[PDB]
Amino acid sequence: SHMSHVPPHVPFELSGAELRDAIVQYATNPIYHDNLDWLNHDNPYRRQLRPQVLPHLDYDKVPGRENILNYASLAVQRLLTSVYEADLVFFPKSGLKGKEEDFRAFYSPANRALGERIRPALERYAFGFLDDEVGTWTAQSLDAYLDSLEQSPVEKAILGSADRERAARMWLVQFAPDFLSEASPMMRNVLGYYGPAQSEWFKVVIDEYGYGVHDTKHSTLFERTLESVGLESDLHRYWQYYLNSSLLLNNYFHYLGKNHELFFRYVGALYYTESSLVDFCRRADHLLREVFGDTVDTTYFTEHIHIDQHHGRMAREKIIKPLVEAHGDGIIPEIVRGIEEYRVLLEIGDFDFSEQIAWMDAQPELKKLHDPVFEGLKQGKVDAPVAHLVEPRGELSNTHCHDGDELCHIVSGTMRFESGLGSSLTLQAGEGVVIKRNRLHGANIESDECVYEIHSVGDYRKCL
Amino acid sequence: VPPHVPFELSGAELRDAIVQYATNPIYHDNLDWLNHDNPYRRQLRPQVLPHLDYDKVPGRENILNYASLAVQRLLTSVYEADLVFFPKSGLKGKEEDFRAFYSPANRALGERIRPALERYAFGFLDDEVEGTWTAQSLDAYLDSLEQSPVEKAILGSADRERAARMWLVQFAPDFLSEASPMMRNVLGYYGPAQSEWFKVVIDEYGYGVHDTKHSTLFERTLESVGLESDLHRYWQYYLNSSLLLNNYFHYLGKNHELFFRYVGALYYTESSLVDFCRRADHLLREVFGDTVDTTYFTEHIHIDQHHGRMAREKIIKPLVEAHGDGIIPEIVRGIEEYRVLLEIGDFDFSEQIAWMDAQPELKKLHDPVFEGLKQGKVDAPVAHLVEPRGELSNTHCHDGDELCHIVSGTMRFESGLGSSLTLQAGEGVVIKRNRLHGANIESDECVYEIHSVGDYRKCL
Ligand SMILES: [Fe+2]
Ligand SMILES: [Fe+2]
Ligand SMILES: [Fe+2]
Ligand SMILES: [Fe+2]
Ligand SMILES: [Fe+2]
Ligand SMILES: [Fe+2]
Numbered sequence: 030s031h032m033s034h035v036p037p038h039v040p041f042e043l044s045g046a047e048l049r050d051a052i053v054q055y056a057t058n059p060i061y062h063d064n065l066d067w068l069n070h071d072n073p074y075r076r077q078l079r080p081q082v083l084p085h086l087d088y089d090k091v092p093g094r095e096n097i098l099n100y101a102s103l104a105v106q107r108l109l110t111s112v113y114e115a116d117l118v119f120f121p122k123s124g125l126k127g128k129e130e131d132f133r134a135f136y137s138p139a140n141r142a143l144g145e146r147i148r149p150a151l152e153r154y155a156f157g158f159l160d161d162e163v164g165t166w167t168a169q170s171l172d173a174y175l176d177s178l179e180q181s182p183v184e185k186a187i188l189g190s191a192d193r194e195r196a197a198r199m200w201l202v203q204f205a206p207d208f209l210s211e212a213s214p215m216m217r218n219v220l221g222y223y224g225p226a227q228s229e230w231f232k233v234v235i236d237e238y239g240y241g242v243h244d245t246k247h248s249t250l251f252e253r254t255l256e257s258v259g260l261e262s263d264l265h266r267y268w269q270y271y272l273n274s275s276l277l278l279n280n281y282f283h284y285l286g287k288n289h290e291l292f293f294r295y296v297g298a299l300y301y302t303e304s305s306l307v308d309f310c311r312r313a314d315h316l317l318r319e320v321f322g323d324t325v326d327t328t329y330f331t332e333h334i335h336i337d338q339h340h341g342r343m344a345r346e347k348i349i350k351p352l353v354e355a356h357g358d359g360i361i362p363e364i365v366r367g368i369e370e371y372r373v374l375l376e377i378g379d380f381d382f383s384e385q386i387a388w389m390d391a392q393p394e395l396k397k398l399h400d401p402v403f404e405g406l407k408q409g410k411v412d413a414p415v416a417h418l419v420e421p422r423g424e425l426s427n428t429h430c431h432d433g434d435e436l437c438h439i440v441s442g443t444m445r446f447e448s449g450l451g452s453s454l455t456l457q458a459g460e461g462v463v464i465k466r467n468r469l470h471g472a473n474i475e476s477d478e479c480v481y482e483i484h485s486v487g488d489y490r491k492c493l
Numbered sequence: 494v495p496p497h498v499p500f501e502l503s504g505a506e507l508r509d510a511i512v513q514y515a516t517n518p519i520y521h522d523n524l525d526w527l528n529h530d531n532p533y534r535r536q537l538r539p540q541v542l543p544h545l546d547y548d549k550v551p552g553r554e555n556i557l558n559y560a561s562l563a564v565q566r567l568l569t570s571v572y573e574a575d576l577v578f579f580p581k582s583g584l585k586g587k588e589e590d591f592r593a594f595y596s597p598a599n600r601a602l603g604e605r606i607r608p609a610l611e612r613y614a615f616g617f618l619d620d621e622v623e624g625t626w627t628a629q630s631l632d633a634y635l636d637s638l639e640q641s642p643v644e645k646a647i648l649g650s651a652d653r654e655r656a657a658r659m660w661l662v663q664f665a666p667d668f669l670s671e672a673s674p675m676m677r678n679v680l681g682y683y684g685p686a687q688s689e690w691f692k693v694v695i696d697e698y699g700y701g702v703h704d705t706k707h708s709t710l711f712e713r714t715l716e717s718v719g720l721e722s723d724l725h726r727y728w729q730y731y732l733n734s735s736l737l738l739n740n741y742f743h744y745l746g747k748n749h750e751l752f753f754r755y756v757g758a759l760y761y762t763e764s765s766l767v768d769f770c771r772r773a774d775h776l777l778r779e780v781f782g783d784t785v786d787t788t789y790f791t792e793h794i795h796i797d798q799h800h801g802r803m804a805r806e807k808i809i810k811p812l813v814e815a816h817g818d819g820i821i822p823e824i825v826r827g828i829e830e831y832r833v834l835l836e837i838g839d840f841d842f843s844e845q846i847a848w849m850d851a852q853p854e855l856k857k858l859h860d861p862v863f864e865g866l867k868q869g870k871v872d873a874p875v876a877h878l879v880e881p882r883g884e885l886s887n888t889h890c891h892d893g894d895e896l897c898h899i900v901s902g903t904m905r906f907e908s909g910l911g912s913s914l915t916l917q918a919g920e921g922v923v924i925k926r927n928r929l930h931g932a933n934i935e936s937d938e939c940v941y942e943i944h945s946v947g948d949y950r951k952c953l
Binding site for chain 2: 034035036037038039040041043050053054057058059062073080081084114115116117118119120124125126129132133136137138139141142143145146148149152209210213216217218219220221222223224225227228229231232235238239240241242243246248264287288289290292355356357359360
């Protein structure tokens with residue numbers, strides 16, 4: 030007879046210019062500004078988000094799979110890792126003393142609320158493509174689907190590399206955010222109050238945490254792996270060397286774990302990953318010992334061979350089966366979707382890593398190729414936009430990528446052109462490099478000043 | 494790099510944002526007193542939220558006022574979006590509510606107001622708790638740390654079983670999700686203290702054996718006294734101070750700048766639980782006899798002797814070594830803040846049981862208070878109400894005393910779990926300030942008056 034005394038619900042909405050401004054607001058916290066070095070030196074609170082570029086991206090136009098290695102996707106993946114990790118406890122290896130101010134800037138009411146406000150939009154941008162890459166089910170047809178699930182691409186990339194040890198080290202650092210916080214995304218799913226499945230999931234977590242014994246915690250095992258090949262285990266020392274697809278894979282499990290409407294997707298991906306980890310770890314142990322000899326510590330990997338045989342079975346019989354019985358067959362499409370989305374992300378990671386190692390290994394030839402590409406430009410085979418740049422010593426461009434090929438041409442000075450971990454070129458006057466689209470790179474000026482040009486050729490093959 | 498605009502949310506924009514979160518339909522008023530196996534529905538009384546001033550942070554003398562109860566209910570709902578719940582009967586039939594609670598919008602709207610809600614909820618502690626410390630001075634302070642208030646409230650009640658049931662349901666959000674707030678601190682990558690903390694969590698989770706998980710033991714306690722173990726069946730009977738105490742540990746666990754406060758509060762609570770559980774076992778057996786299952790409590794009597802030692806020896810001590818004496822004030826602040834919240838809870842619970850037990854006398858006292866108003870003794874604002882059958886006012890409180898007078902119809906006046914009055918024409922009740930209560934209309938129509946007398950004793 031009269032209107033409700035409860036005020037109408039205004040749906041959550043954040044888009045367009047207002048969304049852009051909210052993303053810039055989050056990312057202009059000083060702990061996210063560009064690093065003056067290539068490495069974070071035992072400071073887990075500093076993550077490079079290149080905030081100066083964020084005003085210029087279009088967050089409302091969600092990329093499809095052919096575009097998810099473009100720069101805007103890398104930028105969004107970096108943002109999301111930072112947003113998710115505000116829930117995780119980090120202290121420097123050297124102790125908190127001297128780093129309290131950055132600790133307070135990362136764990137602050139403002140930093141969390143700014144990141145949580147933009148997380149829905151960042152998640153659509155990061156994961157929306159999976160809606161197009163991946164109906165009703167019965168328990169019978171799930172069982173058949175599950176019953177039904179060669180050198181690997183990573184093996185071929187590393188073992189066929191011009192520098193196998195460099196390729197393997199670049200591979201290992203991709204796992205640092207995942208393995209050094211191992212099972213933290215999984216732990217998000219055992220908070221709360223639900224059936225016996227909660228206890229079964231917690232048993233899996235107990236093992237990943239080494240039974241509460243720091244010596245045997247899986248993250249500690251991986252520290253030993255990293256240190257045995259001369260890498261460091263402080264997070265995130267190698268932030269600027271994390272590939273887009275590595276962040277995407279790690280962020281997917283924080284997405285599934287934070288958002289409990291996706292709980293049954295996690296249940297499916299847990300089954301697939303736990304079951305797949307035995308073969309993954311067998312291949313990793315074999316490959317690393319081939320590359321490094323007996324100096325490399327692969328206990329991290331062989332421990333999982335021993336344990337994940339049982340974890341995969343635990344997931345199917347003691348997590349999937351009782352949840353399908355309790356909550357009905359309506360949950361099965363989500364279980365399947367978690368498996369099929371994860372498998373898509375793995376394909377993307379294999380491609381992105383393979384492409385990055387090829388790009389690192391090709392650097393000497395891509396320096397030579399600057400000559401014929403430059404001459405094709407001067408001859409007008411391509412009408413390429415050109416940008417002249419002038420930069421002083423130590424001006425370090427934090428790593429990024431471009432969505433088309435570029436020609437970098439040094440007029441005067443000396444540039445360190447960075448293409449991966451352990452992968453660098455010194456470019457002098459009259460020298461340069463062909464920069465391939467979607468490949469991670471950056472640069473630092475080693476001369477007291479550097480004058481250079483960037484030509485936006487699009488497809489360098491048209492200049493030849 | 495563009496200039497950084499600091500996060501800011503205040504005034505009318507904050508009120509609108511709080512109302513925006515809380516008008517999700519899963520938060521509207523319940524037609525019944527109980528939630529029936531639906532863990533996604535929590536009553537936030539959104540119709541009153543536009544009218545509260547979230548910018549004026551209360552001090553300790555006002556933290557049992559209604560705006561504080563309203564904020565505690567909001568915060569429990571915001572924190573619990575991180576916890577997994579399914580109905581005991583299974584998810585089928587409740588998928589729409591599941592998606593309404595676990596949605597990008599519900600999370601983002603709650604997270605945006607969380608800083609301001611935490612200032613409102615916990616800001617008073619800045620003035621209730623008090624510099625530099627050394628490892629030695631912390632050792633001395635920890636070394637330095639008659640019926641208990643719970644025993645007094647329950648064993649002195651006119652209905653001991655009712656008082657003890659009202660007590661037990663206060664623990665449902667904490668114990669049925671037991672050690673979930675603690676688990677927030679073991680995500681990430683830090684030193685050996687992380688594994689030591691996880692060892693404690695393992696014990697609270699019964700080593701992953703569902704029948705020995707501590708939450709499952711508390712389910713059995715509740716069921717042994719005729720209560721149910723679905724969350725949050727008894728939402729409308731959760732006291733302000735019970736929510737406050739539960740929310741404090743979600744606050745310390747979500748906000749890792751407060752990590753060292755949690756380390757202190759963990760040592761104090763793990764240590765203190767031994768005697769708490771000893772007294773609870775004794776008290777419940779005096780009230781209920783053989784029929785009550787107290788395994789939940791007796792399991793902690795021996796386990797937490799160990800956990801208290803671990804917290805001091807293998808968590809506090811290595812953190813102080815690794816991170817320096819600058820963290821000691823935060824360890825101490827966690828302990829001292831928790832002790833303040835425990836005092837508030839002891840007072841609020843004691844007051845609520847006294848108010849439930851006094852219902853017959855407060856129904857009688859309506860006659861001389863009403864007569865005092867017919868005289869001139871107090872000139873109190875009067876509200877006139879006409880409500881249909883089944884209009885159930887979900888539980889709340891008022892910041893002054895009220896006189897409820899029924900002119901026609903029938904009201905069920907609810908003062909606690911198992912504590913009810915039937916009010917007919919010409920009858921009523923003195924409603925004491927800050928006491929949790931509600932009402933339902935049992936006639937086809939009820940006409941009544943609320944007189945805002947402030948302090949009822951001035952009408953006498
Ligand atoms: Fe593991
Ligand atoms: Fe496993
Ligand atoms: Fe570049
Ligand atoms: Fe416990
Ligand atoms: Fe304990
Ligand atoms: Fe009332």
